[PDB]
Amino acid sequence: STPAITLENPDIKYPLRLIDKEVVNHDTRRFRFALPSPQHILGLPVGQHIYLSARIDGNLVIRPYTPVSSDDDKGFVDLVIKVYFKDTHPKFPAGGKMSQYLESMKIGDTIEFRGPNGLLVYQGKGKFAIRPDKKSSPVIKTVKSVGMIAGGTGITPMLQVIRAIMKDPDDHTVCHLLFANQTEKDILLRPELEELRNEHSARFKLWYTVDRAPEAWDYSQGFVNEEMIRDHLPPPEEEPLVLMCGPPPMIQYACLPNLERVGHPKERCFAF
Numbered sequence: 001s002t003p004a005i006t007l008e009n010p011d012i013k014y015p016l017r018l019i020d021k022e023v024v025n026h027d028t029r030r031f032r033f034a035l036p037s038p039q040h041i042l043g044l045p046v047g048q049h050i051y052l053s054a055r056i057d058g059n060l061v062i063r064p065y066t067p068v069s070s071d072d073d074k075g076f077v078d079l080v081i082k083v084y085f086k087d088t089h090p091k092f093p094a095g096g097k098m099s100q101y102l103e104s105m106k107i108g109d110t111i112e113f114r115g116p117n118g119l120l121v122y123q124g125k126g127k128f129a130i131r132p133d134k135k136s137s138p139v140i141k142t143v144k145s146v147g148m149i150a151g152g153t154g155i156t157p158m159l160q161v162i163r164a165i166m167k168d169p170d171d172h173t174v175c176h177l178l179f180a181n182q183t184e185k186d187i188l189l190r191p192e193l194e195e196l197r198n199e200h201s202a203r204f205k206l207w208y209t210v211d212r213a214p215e216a217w218d219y220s221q222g223f224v225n226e227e228m229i230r231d232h233l234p235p236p237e238e239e240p241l242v243l244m245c246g247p248p249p250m251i252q253y254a255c256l257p258n259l260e261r262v263g264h265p266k267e268r269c270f271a272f
């Protein structure tokens, strides 16, 4: 038999109860929400995400999240969240709406989840099903390697796919991640990524870039560029699938132009 799923219908909102909040570091949290019973699973295909929705300061706010849990977890869903506090970044004085709302929640408060959503589903052993849109059907793309470019919060769609691959010992797909952040301090999920590298280096390649680097830095500095894509993603000759998730100036200026310069087919590069 299979566990009961939580996300039965994508147009229903499921208010889930907050049961634990971990302060990972000053501005990073892990929020654990209870599913309807301890024996439920979320019901989120690999490749897809959920949305959170709430009335925040009187207005509707909806945002996508990819849990760090999986359908192997019974009874709960975990979200890792970067909190964007007001009065910290000069270009974003108000901070972030949903992330500050999450930070304000009390244990026992609920928030609405909906899903699953997204045009890409990983079907295992290198096979991806990618819709060109929500009523069109998908392209069952099969690849030997996956190039992944994440910026900031865009890591969690990548991590979900990486973990699904690594846990299947008969999945020979190789994932190459290039992960960009503002600073070293601002990197999400570094221990988790480095554990995967420790255990699965043959199938998981890891590289970081930071906009500004610390004194002691072993990786790259600057925005994603042509050289980083040549050096840290599979070559286009091997026809990898290229996945991206990051702030829309990152995708537009740093990722797509440079993927094209290396020779990857731009129009095949998928943005979560």
Ligand SMILES: Cc1cc2nc3c(=O)[nH]c(=O)nc-3n(C[C@H](O)[C@H](O)[C@H](O)COP(=O)(O)OP(=O)(O)OC[C@H]3O[C@@H](n4cnc5c(N)ncnc54)[C@H](O)[C@@H]3O)c2cc1C
Pocket (backbone or CB within 6 Å): 049, 063, 064, 065, 066, 067, 079, 080, 081, 082, 083, 084, 085, 086, 088, 089, 092, 094, 095, 096, 097, 098, 099, 100, 153, 154, 156, 157, 245, 247, 272
């Ligand atoms: C598929 C997918 C999965 C995602 N998964 C996650 C996840 O697991 N965890 C997660 O935390 N986010 C995730 N995100 C990002 C998420 O959807 C929101 O963009 C994020 O929570 C910020 O929303 P907000 O309402 O707090 O900010 P908004 O009010 O929408 O602010 C807009 C933008 O302003 C920038 N900004 C605001 N304040 C600051 C600040 N102090 N410093 C730097 N930049 C600032 C940010 O880039 C922010 O996105 C995901 C996005 C996608 C597309």
